[PDB]
Amino acid sequence: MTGAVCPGSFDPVTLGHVDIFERAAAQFDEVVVAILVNPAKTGMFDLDERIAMVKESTTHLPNLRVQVGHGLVVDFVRSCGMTAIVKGLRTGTDFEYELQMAQMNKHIAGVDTFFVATAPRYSFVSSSLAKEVAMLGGDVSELLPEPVNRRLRDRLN
Template identity: 60%
Template sequence: MIRAVCPGSFDPVTNGHLDVIERTAGLFDEIIVAVLVNEKKQSLFTVEERMEMLAEVTAHCPNVRVSSFKGLLVDFCQQNDVRAIVKGLRAVTDFDYELQMAQMNRRLSGVDTMFMSASPEYSFIASSLVKEVARGGGDVAHLLPGPVFRRLSERLGPRGGS
């Protein structure tokens, strides 16, 4: 079985994330969507909430499971027999950083990284931007899966918390 991981913060999961996960699910036997536990970062949703949302929006993909990790991604990969890391790229600026990470991960563990370009309709979406627009009262419904948008609206209020 060839297993890959799609890691991220997913705070919240966007349509761009879901697109990469679904496309990756078609390429590997099993995909682990791994939510990073970063206690130094102030998140809108808890790790458990993000995992619940991911499980809900990927329920139609039988070979996708959701987990979380703390520390180095390569350690998670080794513990879970993961052979590839799949990262979505929105722009060249993403590539600059992700290439360095991919080379370090390969050096540390032998785990390869595959880059998947974002679909054009999602290439501008970032969780941080979605939260900023939502907090300002902007409409982000078209950027998020339905269940995620509902939770975001509950968390920030009908006008994004303003």
């Protein structure tokens, strides 16, 4: 029973994220997408919306489930009966930041992190940039799953 957790805010989930989910689901018997919500409430979509968008965008991955994460990600990972986190990397700068978190996570809980390199076509896709461009009237529909596009179009209509 090999398993990985894919943690993130997913606000909203992008096609870059879905790519990572697919790639994790191909290599681990079970994948859990863990949505870690910002407490301060500064995000675009609420938690219920973020969950629905991930679920709606991952109906083709039978071995993937979606859950809200609470506390340290390592504690969530251990509560799933797993010892691996899977995350995507776009750049060397991303790597150096994630490296610190991964080494810390291994230190405190013995939980390992496996990184996958972004698909080339989604290298520039982030939730933040997608939101920024969307908020200014730009068309980012090709970078996001249709379930997200539907919701985005409803907010600007």
